[PDB]
Amino acid sequence: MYICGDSTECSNLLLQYGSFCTQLNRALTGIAVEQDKNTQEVFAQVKQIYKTPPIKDFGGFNFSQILPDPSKPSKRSPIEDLLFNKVTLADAGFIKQYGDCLGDIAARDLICAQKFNGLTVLPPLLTDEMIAQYTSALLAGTICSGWTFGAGPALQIPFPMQMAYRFNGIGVTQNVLYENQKLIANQFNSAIGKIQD
Amino acid sequence: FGGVSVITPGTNTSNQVAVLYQDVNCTTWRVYSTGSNVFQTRAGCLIGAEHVNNSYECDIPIGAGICASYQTSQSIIAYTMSLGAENSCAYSNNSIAIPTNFTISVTTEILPVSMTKTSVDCT
Amino acid sequence: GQSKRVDFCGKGYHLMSFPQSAPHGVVFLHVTYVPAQEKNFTTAPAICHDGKAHFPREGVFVSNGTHWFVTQRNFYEPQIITTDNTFVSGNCDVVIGIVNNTVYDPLQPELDS
Amino acid sequence: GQSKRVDFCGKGYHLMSFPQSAPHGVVFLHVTYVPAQEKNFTTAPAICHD
Amino acid sequence: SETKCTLKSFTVEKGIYQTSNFRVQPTESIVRFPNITNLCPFGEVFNAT
Ligand SMILES: *[C@@H]1O[C@H](CO)[C@@H](O[C@@H]2O[C@H](CO)[C@@H](O)[C@H](O)[C@H]2NC(C)=O)[C@H](O)[C@H]1NC(C)=O
Ligand SMILES: *[C@@H]1O[C@H](CO)[C@@H](O[C@@H]2O[C@H](CO)[C@@H](O)[C@H](O)[C@H]2NC(C)=O)[C@H](O)[C@H]1NC(C)=O
Ligand SMILES: *[C@@H]1O[C@H](CO)[C@@H](O[C@@H]2O[C@H](CO)[C@@H](O)[C@H](O)[C@H]2NC(C)=O)[C@H](O)[C@H]1NC(C)=O
Numbered sequence: 209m210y211i212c213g214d215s216t217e218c219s220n221l222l223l224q225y226g227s228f229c230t231q232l233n234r235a236l237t238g239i240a241v242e243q244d245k246n247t248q249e250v251f252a253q254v255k256q257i258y259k260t261p262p263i264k265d266f267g268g269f270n271f272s273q274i275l276p277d278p279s280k281p282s283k284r285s286p287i288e289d290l291l292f293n294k295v296t297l298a299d300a301g302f303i304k305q306y307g308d309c310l311g312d313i314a315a316r317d318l319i320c321a322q323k324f325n326g327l328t329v330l331p332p333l334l335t336d337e338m339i340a341q342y343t344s345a346l347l348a349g350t351i352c353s354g355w356t357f358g359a360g361p362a363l364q365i366p367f368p369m370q371m372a373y374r375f376n377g378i379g380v381t382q383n384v385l386y387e388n389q390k391l392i393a394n395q396f397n398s399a400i401g402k403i404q405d
Numbered sequence: 406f407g408g409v410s411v412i413t414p415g416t417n418t419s420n421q422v423a424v425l426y427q428d429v430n431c432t433t434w435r436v437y438s439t440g441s442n443v444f445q446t447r448a449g450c451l452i453g454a455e456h457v458n459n460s461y462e463c464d465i466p467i468g469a470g471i472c473a474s475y476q477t478s479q480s481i482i483a484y485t486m487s488l489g490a491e492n493s494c495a496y497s498n499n500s501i502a503i504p505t506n507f508t509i510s511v512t513t514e515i516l517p518v519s520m521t522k523t524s525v526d527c528t
Numbered sequence: 529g530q531s532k533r534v535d536f537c538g539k540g541y542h543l544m545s546f547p548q549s550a551p552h553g554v555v556f557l558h559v560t561y562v563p564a565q566e567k568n569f570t571t572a573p574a575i576c577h578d579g580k581a582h583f584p585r586e587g588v589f590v591s592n593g594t595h596w597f598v599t600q601r602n603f604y605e606p607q608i609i610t611t612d613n614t615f616v617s618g619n620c621d622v623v624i625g626i627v628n629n630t631v632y633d634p635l636q637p638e639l640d641s
Numbered sequence: 642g643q644s645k646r647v648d649f650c651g652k653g654y655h656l657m658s659f660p661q662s663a664p665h666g667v668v669f670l671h672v673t674y675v676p677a678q679e680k681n682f683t684t685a686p687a688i689c690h691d
Numbered sequence: 692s693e694t695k696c697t698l699k700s701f702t703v704e705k706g707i708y709q710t711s712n713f714r715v716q717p718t719e720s721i722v723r724f725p726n727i728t729n730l731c732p733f734g735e736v737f738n739a740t
């Protein structure tokens with residue numbers, strides 16, 4: 209398509225070195241495969257899907273900007289919804305019909321120009337909804353059981369004790385956390401709000 | 406205008422194939438044939454596969470959440486892939502789970518270290 | 529060595545590894561510790577003894593149907609809560625969720641005998 | 642987990658992290674502990690008792 | 692000398708260099724044509740009435 213454009217005489221000449229085209233596509237196919245693989249290695253680490261908990265009092269710790277918003281058509285957290293709105297993609301969806309490119313000629317749409325010359329963009333295996341589900345499972349896991357869900361079975365723990373362990377882990381004795389629990393929870397909640405802004 | 410790919414069970418098993426038309430909506434379709442078994446997805450119009458409402462693990466990926474496999478009187482089927490096992494926990498502010506026993510597990514990790522060394526005489 | 533990087537040297541807690549030769553590469557056998565059977569216990573952040581607040585030194589306060597014990601975090605082996613298993617910081621009016629229990633004192637019986 | 646690698650999971654002492662989805666990538670929210678007000682004290686390596 | 696020419700140098704440092712390939716030369720030639728004794732009909736083609 210790119211080289212000959214349906215010209216028969218060109219196509220017949222192109223065949224003189226057709227092993228070249230096959231090689232170019234082996235290389236591009238290998239790239240496409242890796243892109244789906246990369247996505248799974250980063251997100252699909254835990255195949256146990258934990259559900260987002262009802263929001264309970266976690267000890268003053270507010271996770272509403274990181275957990276999924278159930279009221280939306282796409283259950284993205286408030287932060288995720290912002291991240292998705294800010295990055296702009298070349299087009300919407302992977303279906304472009306012949307009749308759309310034939311009708312909208314005056315439009316000079318770059319996507320149609322690419323397709324008519326043999327350049328095709330393929331869809332991801334994991335959809336944005338699927339990625340959001342992996343993210344939600346990891347957050348649900350962390351809040352409910354800390355790091356234990358990574359190590360093996362998940363073992364439930366009160367959120368504030370999870371934090372106590374995390375403080376001992378940095379060299380600060382846990383009595384500091386409990387004595388200052390309200391302060392720590394408030395600073396945490398404030399910091400998350402600042403990030404979305 | 407393009408958009409064609411073929412989903413194949415091995416040819417040492419069967420010669421049934423499904424054909425995906427990436428730029429066809431199917432809802433005179435710019436397809437080679439129909440013959441029923443027409444399923445529309447975000448990745449294109451898939452002709453020659455039965456849609457199944459059960460989720461399974463992915464075998465041959467198609468795209469946009471859809472995978473296919475050859476299953477029983479065997480034919481090509483398509484389905485939305487499973488993302489993992491459903492699991493659960495019960496967050497509570499006054500209880501903890503503590504291990505009482507353990508197991509020893511040994512796993513294997515495989516990594517390449519080197520490739521073939523070559524030399525070429527251009528003349 | 530013994531790595532503490534999560535899932536770096538296999539899933540679970542890493543204990544040790546053994547390499548094996550392979551053509552064009554290396555295969556690692558990673559030995560890890562994995563928690564198995566587990567039980568659900570009631571818990572608390574602190575013990576209130578004589579009005580002072582006691583925290584575990586190396587463990588968690590765990591309760592069965594009638595009694596409080598202190599256990600190591602990764603293995604259920606109950607110990608009596610004593611003054612040698614805890615440290616004291618502050619008092620019972622600060623910690624949210626402070627249960628009251630006896631913090632056994634190993635010296636008093638010797639002073640009495 | 643809880644990494645001890647310096648500045649790997651953000652500046653300060655790492656406590657925990659939360660991933661967020663993004664198109665073509667991942668965004669991490671890293672929660673760290675940072676020392677704040679401080680005081681100057683006299684010090685010594687050891688105490689001589691008896 | 693082959694190494695020196697490849698590297699464009701009159702000095703070669705320590706190490707292993709690949710140096711072309713082992714080659715041999717032909718020693719004689721062979722010509723094999725069908726044993727045809729007739730001359731082509733040049734007269735008939737070019738000297739026709
Ligand atoms: C977690 O924080 C959010 C703010 O980020 C709280 O939501 C706000 O609640 C007030 C009072 O009802 C409303 O006037 C605001 O409009 C809400 N803001 C948003 C963005 O929804 C939320 O209630 C807090 N959660 C908990 C459990 O305390
Ligand atoms: C330690 O730092 C925190 C701030 O991170 C201080 O808390 C603030 O104190 C002022 C003055 O009383 C209040 O107006 C603010 O509302 C408090 N902030 C929060 C988030 O609660 C705290 O007083 C400092 N403390 C010491 C050395 O004890
Ligand atoms: C909680 O643990 C304690 C200590 O093991 C159990 O109490 C003991 O039970 C045995 C009989 O099995 C008696 O001989 C001991 O004298 C008891 N100890 C004390 C201090 O009374 C207790 O039964 C366990 N609680 C529950 C609900 O299982």
Ligand SMILES: *[C@@H]1O[C@H](CO)[C@@H](O)[C@H](O)[C@H]1NC(C)=O
Pocket residue numbers: 301303430432445446447448449
């Ligand atoms: C196909 O066209 C219908 C309208 O008839 C539309 O609702 C649907 O989303 C289109 N399919 C895809 C995969 O975009």
Ligand SMILES: *[C@@H]1O[C@H](CO)[C@@H](O)[C@H](O)[C@H]1NC(C)=O
Pocket residue numbers: 498499624625
């Ligand atoms: C847990 O929450 C309940 C309210 O749902 C409250 O009555 C109870 O005292 C809390 N316990 C702890 C340890 O915080």
Ligand SMILES: *[C@@H]1O[C@H](CO)[C@@H](O)[C@H](O)[C@H]1NC(C)=O
Pocket residue numbers: 733734737738
């Ligand atoms: C044509 O005929 C002449 C005699 O008239 C002769 O000399 C000549 O060689 C002939 N040509 C060929 C190609 O035989």
